[PDB]
Structure formats: structure tokens, C-alpha cells
Subunit: 398 residues, 2 copies
């Protein structure tokens, strides 16, 4: 029930529609040769009429912080081109807005993934956190949808794309600790490393092997620590050594080792964590929800955390209330990345039989997120298969 303020410009005649995905809408914008910000308030349609004729127009609807803008064809192509050559002209949070809405409209069915992606390609030049983060925030859920389906080829290619994009910025991070922002941008080191960018997955191994070769006495930078452990847990000696430290020793490493422990393709170890977390003795049950969410997020262990959750639901609600923050969160972490009608009806088929235990906001919120996923992917899989098979192509004449 949020806005959907369609925009059609002709010359300096700026028409704008209303469908509000009536209402009342305190539109804001920034034009091309403006270096300033403007005011307006929409009936169904209106026009405002621009003073001078200008090249591009960026509606950042002054409605609180959340708004949905659509400029259709030519309009998005004007903006796509601004970022692709002169993205510095606009701000970081406007960098975000664009990226955010570009993808919003893809799932709403007013913009095609081909185009929302044919934009993400400028991020190779983005040297700021906010847009990069946004980018990842919109692009990551796609491939996690893929991870839960027969899709190795396009998964891998997507990720290559994603890493290929970010590489420059990845490659210029010192392995140390900038401001609260630069240090957090850490996330790249991890993400690089998780996806096998090899100058990442070679130095982390180094840092890890040494660290454990002092029984974890080396001081690792905090920023690096996640990547370091994330490659560590991919080997049996790695998992075990790091897990011995978890119990034996601090507050933040905990989380970092907690996070890094679940990032394992070992189906045995994984099962272990669900199990013991459940108890409380080895891993305390105070953080079973988080462990369950992350395992759901694993590429191999997604079917475990759902299976476990179902096989032992009767006992989770005795231990975490029938419907609560934890429980809801748990429901959603083991189901909302499913992209099949086969997963959907199981997700429906389970909860719609608990009767007394069966109809919470998390249940019907999740089914929908899956019913979106089904349609989204059906529409877009084949599309994004090619958009990537049509990107690594002359990625210079005369």
C-alpha cells in the first residue's frame, strides 16, 4: 500500500500519474542543471510545467523516506546514462534511491530486469558505501533464490558478474581497520572471499593458518576476521579449531565464529549445530534463531533448517512461545527463499495442519514472499540467463 507515482516528461512539460501501489503526495525532485531541490503536491494526474528545458529529472518523492517512482522508457534510459558516465553529479543516497526503485519496479512488473541490471553496471565506479550496499541488498537475494533450485550455471555466472563488478573496490581495501563507514565496507572482504575471488581466498587462508598456528594468539584485524574465519571453516581442522575457541574463550569473536561456523558445506557439522544449539550446553539456545536463519541461508544446508524446524515444531513453541519475534523470524528464515510451487504447498501444507499450534502474520507473510518468488523467477530466470550471456561481450575501433 505504498506510492506508485508514474512520471512522463515531454520537453519541460512534466506530467505525473497516480496509482498508489485517492491517497492525498508531497513530491520532491532534482533536475539536471539545478544543483538544488524542488517542491510539488499531486488528484489522479497533474502536470507542473518546468521553467527551463532540462535533460534529466529525479523524483525523490518527499513522502517520508519510502516512495515508488517510475519514469517508463527514455526516462530510465536518461538516468541509466547519467550514472554510467557522471554518477558523481548526484549524491550517494540518490545513488541508492535509483538502485532501489530500479529493482522495485522489476518485481512490480513496470520495469524489466534487463534494464534494472543494465543500470547496476555503473557501480564498478561507485566509491561509496551506501549505493554499493544497496546494490548487494537488491542483487544478492536473486542468487540465493537460485541457490535453492537446479541452477548452477546461471548462479555461478551471476556471482561472477557481481564480483566482476565490485572487484576494483574489493582490490583496494587494506586488510586492517578508516571511519565507521570505510571499515564496514569488511563486507567486501567477506563477500569477495565467500564467492572464491581468489586474491581474497588465499590471503584469508594465510591469516587463518597463522592465527591457529599460535592457538589463536595472533591479533587479527576485526574487519578481516569474518573473511579469515569464513575460509577457515571450509576444512575439518578449520571448523574444529575455531569451534574449540568459541567455547574456550570474548563477545564479538563469538558472533564472528558463530557466523563462520554455519558457512559450511559439511552436512554433518551443520546438523550438529541445530542439535546442540537446541539443547543449550555446548551452544546456548539463546541464539538458536540466528543459527537457524543462517543455515537456511547456506547454499547446501537450506533444506536442513526447514526440515529440522518442521520435525521439531511442537518443541520449539514450548521453548520459544507459540508466536513471537524469534518464532516468526525462524519461520521466515527456513522458507522465504523458495522459488517453487512444490515448496509453496509444503510451506502451506505444514502450518495449515497445526490447528491449535497455524495462522500467524509470519506464516501468511512468508507464503506471499514465496508466491512472489515463484512468479518473479518464472518471468526472469531465462531473461537473466541471457542478460549475463550478453554482458561478457566486449566487456576501441577506428
Amino acid at each position: 500500500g505504498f506510492p506508485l507515482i508514474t512520471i512522463t516528461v515531454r520537453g519541460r512539460n512534466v506530467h505525473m500519474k497516480q496509482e498508489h501501489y485517492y491517497l492525498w503526495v508531497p513530491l520532491t525532485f532534482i533536475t539536471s542543471k539545478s544543483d538544488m531541490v524542488h517542491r510539488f503536491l499531486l488528484t489522479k494526474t497533474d502536470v507542473l510545467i518546468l521553467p527551463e528545458e532540462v535533460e534529466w529529472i529525479k523524483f525523490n518523492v518527499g513522502m517520508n523516506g519510502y516512495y515508488i517512482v517510475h519514469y517508463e522508457d527514455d526516462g530510465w534510459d536518461s538516468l541509466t546514462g547519467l550514472l554510467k558516465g557522471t554518477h558523481t553529479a548526484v549524491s550517494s543516497n540518490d545513488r541508492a534511491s535509483l538502485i532501489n526503485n530500479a529493482f522495485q519496479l522489476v518485481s512490480i512488473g513496470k520495469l524489466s530486469i534487463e534494464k534494472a541490471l543494465d543500470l547496476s553496471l555503473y557501480l564498478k565506479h561507485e566509491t561509496e558505501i551506501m549505493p554499493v550496499f544497496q546494490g548487494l541488498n537488491e542483487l544478492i537475494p536473486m542468487y540465493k533464490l537460485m541457490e535453492k533450485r537446479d541452477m548452477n550455471e546461471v548462479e555461478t555466472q551471476f556471482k561472477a558478474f557481481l564480483i566482476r563488478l565490485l572487484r576494483d573496490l574489493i582490490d583496494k581495501q587494506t586488510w586492517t581497520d578508516g571511519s565507521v563507514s570505510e571499515r564496514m565496507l569488511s563486507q567486501l572482504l567477506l563477500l569477495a572471499c565467500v564467492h572464491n575471488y581468489q586474491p581474497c581466498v588465499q590471503r584469508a587462508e594465510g591469516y587463518f593458518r597463522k592465527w591457529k598456528e599460535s592457538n589463536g594468539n595472533l591479533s587479527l584485524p576485526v574487519d578481516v576476521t569474518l573473511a579469515v574465519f569464513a575460509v577457515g571453516a571450509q576444512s575439518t581442522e578449520g571448523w574444529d579449531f575455531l569451534y574449540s575457541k568459541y567455547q574456550f574463550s570474548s563477545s564479538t569473536e563469538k558472533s564472528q565464529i558463530e557466523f563462520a561456523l554455519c558457512r559450511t558445506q559439511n552436512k554433518e557439522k551443520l546438523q550438529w549445530l541445530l542439535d546442540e544449539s537446541f539443547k543449550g550446553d555446548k551452544i546456548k539456545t539463546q541464539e538458536f534463531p540466528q543459527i537457524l536463519t543462517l543455515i537456511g541461508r547456506n547454499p547446501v544446508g537450506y533444506p536442513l533448517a526447514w526440515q529440522f524446524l518442521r520435525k521439531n515444531w511442537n518443541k520449539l513453541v514450548q521453548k520459544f512461545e507459540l508466536g513471537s519475534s524469534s518464532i516468526a523470524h525462524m519461520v521466515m528464515g527456513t522458507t522465504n527463499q523458495f522459488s517453487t510451487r512444490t515448496r509453496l504447498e509444503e510451506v502451506k501444507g505444514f502450518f495449515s495442519s497445526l490447528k491449535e499450534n497455524s495462522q500467524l502474520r509470519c506464516v501468511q507473510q512468508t507464503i506471499e514472499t514465496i508466491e512472489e518468488n515463484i512468479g518473479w523467477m518464472d518471468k526472469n530466470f531465462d531473461k537473466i540467463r541471457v542478460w549475463l550471456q550478453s554482458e561478457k561481450l566486449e566487456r576501441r575501433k577506428f
Copy 2:
């Protein structure tokens, strides 16, 4: 990066060697094994022993890891492979060798003569990926030549380039109907032919253009050939003028945009820079791509450079120094230089802007200081190598 992993082989003894404390995960395929093998060079040098003897071996498979391979003793055997049976290797791997071959001409140890030889098999190359690689390895050479007074060698190269691609150039149907990359090859090969003045592509493009003009652009042009069609139309005032009328679709502009900057009309080349800057008759947000493209133009290159320096105070204000934008511009106006005089022209300008000390500048100078000595070393070798390709030399 830039580890240089030297490979010497005697029988089954396969010696690595290292260059710039590196740890290097090595991978390799042979004439016996299609399988990508594994080897971790952690020490400076090492060896391995292949199970049986091999006609050839090749390292860094599919270009997955960042190391460049030079084959000692070697390269000769990898050539004859591609010259006789290139279908035995894979497509991505055909690219590797072309990249590397020419790469190692950068740093030496491999002569231009031998790298250029390798590129000869492309006469039979029936796949997007290697074709492209060969183009974008060879092209940046005659781009360096265009910016000097080496016409006879420039033209001789260019013809060569075409002669090389020709059989495949004539194979493209002037339509769309194709899968991905299939349609991209026609896209790009028709252009190349046309720009280098291959007549059968220049004559077809004049026709398509001509009849399109005789319709007020109401003629159906296939997307692929559109570039070539326009690329040759803008070589006359009636065609440049016409296309701009059309300029003022989301993709049509880009072709007409590109096709415009090809004109050797240094008068209207100026007009594009000037009016792109204003933002009125062409967008301001498009000055980066028009400046970089005028950079490449064999006759207009000086303007785009000249315009930048004469007008640098308004671009740094308009787009902000140290941007994606400004760096792209600096490097596109200057990276194809290949003389000492041009060097001091770069160093002289940018360093005098007081605070100058940013990536592109430091980056460009390095790119030109590498050009200079590349050309010193290679121009003559290439001059004479060309004089020999033409040698069909069929006896008995």
C-alpha cells in the same frame, strides 16, 4: 598481480618458475588429457612429471587465475596446434593464448614476430571469443600508429587485419536472426570491415544508408548492421547532417552518436565537443563518451585532447576531479600517445594544475611511457613482418 609463471618442459619433466613470496595454484591441460590438472607452486621453482609424454601442454586454463604463462624451449608447439588443429583446444582457451602471446610481447621474452605469427591461424577462427580477443589485442597497435606519420605500415597492418578476418567477414548475413554472440559478431565485424574500407561492406552500407535517407529514416534496418550502415553514411556532409536530425529512440542515438564522431571533418568534430559541453543541442551527461570517441578518431585525436586542456577548468567544476568521469576523459584523450614529446605534453599540463596528484594522471603517463618504448622496439619489427605475411610461396 603479475606473477609470470615460466614453463620449461623436457620429456615429462615439467618445470615451473616464478617472477613478479607467492603461492600459486597452477592448472594445466595436455595433448593427452582434456582434464584441467592441479599443481601448487609454493617455492620459487619446482617440477612435476607427466604420466605419459605430450605433444603440447598449456597452463592457466580458461583464465581463472591471475598469472601469465611464458613457455620456454615451447610457444612454437602451441602455434602449430592452432595453425593445424585449433579445434583440439577449447574456445576460451584459444583466447588465453592470444592474450598471453601478445601480453608477453609487452614485457619481452616473446618477440612481436612470434606473437603475430600465432594470430595468423585466426584465418580459420569460427567463434566469437577468440575473434574478439585477437581484434582487441591487435587494434590497440594501429591506434598507436594512427597518432604518428606511419601511413604505409598503418595501412599494411589494417589490410592484414582484414585479410585475416575476411572469409568470416563475408559469412555474415545482413539481418538479426541469431543466438547471442552470433548476432554480436556480425554487429562488430561489419563495422570493422566498413571502417577499414573493406569495399563489399562499404558498398552494401552506402546502399542501406542511401535508401534509408530516401525514406526520412522510415526504412527497416536490422539492429546489427545499423552501425556499419551509419558508420559509412557520416563520411559525407549530407549523411552526417541527416543523422543528427534523427538524433534530436534509446539505442538509435548511441549508433548515430558513434557513427558521427567517425567523420574526418575536423570542423564538425569540433562542433560535437563544443555543443555536447553546452548541454543544449547534445546532452552534457554525454560529454564523456563523445570526448573518448574523438580521442580514437585517426584525425580528430588532437582536438579532444586540445579541448580538454583549453577547457579543463569547467569540466572539473561540472563533473568533479577524481571521478569515474574525469579519469575516463583524461585517459581517453592521452593513453594512445606513443612519443616523448607527447609525454612531456601530459606531464607538463597536469602537474602544473598545482594540486594533478590523482589516479588517471599517474596512470596515463605510465600507459604512455610504456607505449613509447613498445613502439621504439616493435614498429620496425612489424614493418618488416608485414612485408612477409604476403608470401604464398604447391611445388613438386
